[model samples]
Target chain A: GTIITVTAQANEKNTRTVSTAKGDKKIISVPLFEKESNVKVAYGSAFLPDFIQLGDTVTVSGRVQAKEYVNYNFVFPTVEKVFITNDNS
Target chain B: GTIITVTAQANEKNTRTVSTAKGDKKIISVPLFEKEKGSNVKVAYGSAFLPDFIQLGDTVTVSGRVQAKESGEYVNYNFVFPTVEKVFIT
Candidate 1:
């Protein structure tokens, strides 16, 4: 019942490497286009079924979680399903 | 609703400070008791209202986004509303 759906573009530069107790983790930021404004979502690489290349239009479905860093709020999606709607390569 | 709610005890040592673009942020970890096992959730201090604040062993109910993390299979909960059951005495 708790699920969030997003269709966004995958960019190479949107990836960030974070150091964690489990080791280095990759988090991908995908741009979600909304009518009012665009929002970027952080998606953990563990949830993806396949690799995403640059400029790939991806549709991801999952549960959403909230995060705040430096007074800025962030929404991270615990992706359950992914579909490469369009791919450059 | 896409919100995850957790009721757990607040520990003083569970707090962690992290650097961010705007400034430093605080994250508090709360232990989740599961039947088979247990988990720890990282709750980020954003705009959540904690009227009485939190202290050690205080039971709190947090409602917010239960985001995921790479370490300890842990997830960060950015609470919008945090309610403390007992008041801390001065």
Candidate 2:
């Protein structure tokens, strides 16, 4: 399983490109909700925490599941069994 | 024209309910982005801000306009506006 953390929120409508550990590049969106929470952590505002701002780094633990919303004309991957590693920078 | 500000972002899957001055109730979402910005302010992260928490209420200024988008089996509205409200700490 791969853990993905939110580096920054894409505010623009255009897609953004991200680099992977495998030395690959993929396009992502801004203002996106990105964070990996642990199983032990409670699912709430205090547990799930807030949006990870720019320059914040956390560890995500889970497998990526891609969901396609035909009506919205977009596909987004949801991270499950997630957990945050560290917030202190 | 009514100016709608985002008080909080709806995190749950269900729609949230809000009260109005006319004694009308409306369903809204959590984790919602609220704030009315001035026209002269730059549209950057430092200028245009993010979702305000539940405790804070800022004065939002603008007319509301809804746009339609098809998502899966349902359609959602995109509230378009020029600015959000003041975000002063004091």
Candidate 3:
């Protein structure tokens, strides 16, 4: 499991405003603390659940899969998950 | 294990300057890719080492003890290490 200390939690509202270089913004809505704290959320091109909050420490563990996409602009070289962190531990 | 997707890699130079509601900033510096990509970085409170560039809002796995601090009109929190992410796999 790769762990990085969180310096601060970005405001949940501000979470949506930040965009990647690829110009993609995603807000996931999953059950808060429903999943095991050890549960891993999967990765893909779809929107994720939004049950997670900022400042809450979490761990995301899964295989890293790379991909490419084209939206308003072209973005290549991206990664996707096999799973992600869930609150239901 | 909580998993969140990374929106983008915050440029290395811009990795610093994140302030918490309590008012604190930290930067971690460790061997890149030397530790298992899946390795967890521990949290602590102090003058820590931060990596140069990692995307903002990147989901990372970490565990450590944390504490609160106040510096000259600024309130802050700090975490001290038990262990940090190294490329090695356990």
Candidate 4:
């Protein structure tokens, strides 16, 4: 399986809403592991709880994906399970 | 245990000569994973037995480490890794 486990320190949280067929939905993206290799951003939908705080140590399990559009190309992990192992506060 | 494996597209290669206690040595540094967060430079010594340079846009994998070091007199807060194991060009 391509699913992998990643543990990193959260840099920040970004949330946005988009209009969809069902209705408006919230999407969350978190930047993590600024000092390591591979997957930097974690993307997920509003169905998941927002528990990651700045500088929190989070462990995520999901599949790595590459996002490319025009001049923008990024690789990140899809947030399947997120665990805040260490809280910043 | 801090050693990490990194795979990314090679952007460019930089080589420099620095004087050390052991003598003047060549330092090779390559920039990879530019669009990704975290360290962007992979460093190694001339003894690494790497090709003169890597083809830009080619994917490369190397095992190394992340260390907080200064690149210049005023540039602080830089993260880089020293190549430890191997470098794969594909």
Each prediction's TM-score against the native? 0.29, 0.20, 0.24, 0.37
Q: Write the per-residue lDDT of candidate 4 for residues B1-90, one digit (tens) a residue.
A: 122344444444544456667655544343322333343432222112233354445554554433333345422222244443334644
Clashing pairs in 1: A66-B65
Question: TM-score of chain B only, all predictions?
Answer: 0.42, 0.29, 0.34, 0.37
Top TM-score: which candidate number? 4
- Which tens-of-lDDT digit does each residue in B1-90 have in candidate 3? 222222112234324666779565546422212245686973332333334333344433333444458779865544455233221111
For each candidate, the DockQ is 0.03, 0.02, 0.03, 0.06
Lowest-lDDT window of 10 residues in candidate 4 chain B?
B41-50
Assess the local accuracy of residue A34 in candidate 4 as a C-alpha lDDT between 0 and 100. 32
User: What lDDT does each candidate get?
Assistant: 0.41, 0.30, 0.34, 0.38
Q: What are the runs in model 3 whose C-alpha is more than 4 Å off? A: A1-89, B1-14, B17-48, B51-59, B86-90
Candidate 2 residues A1-89, lDDT tens each?
43222322222233334555664343433222425664432111111123433233222222334434411111233311211222122
lDDT of 2 at B39: 52
lDDT of 4 by residue, A1-89 (tens): 12233444444344455676686554444331233233222232222225444555544444333323312122343344445465788
Q: How well is candidate 2 docked (DockQ)?
A: 0.02
Q: For candidate 1, lDDT tens digit of each residue in A1-89?
A: 12334555555676556676666554555421111113223332323324555565555544334322311122344443335455778
Error of 1 at B58 (Å): 36
DockQ of 1: 0.03
Displacement of residue A5 (Cα, Å) in model 4 is 9.9
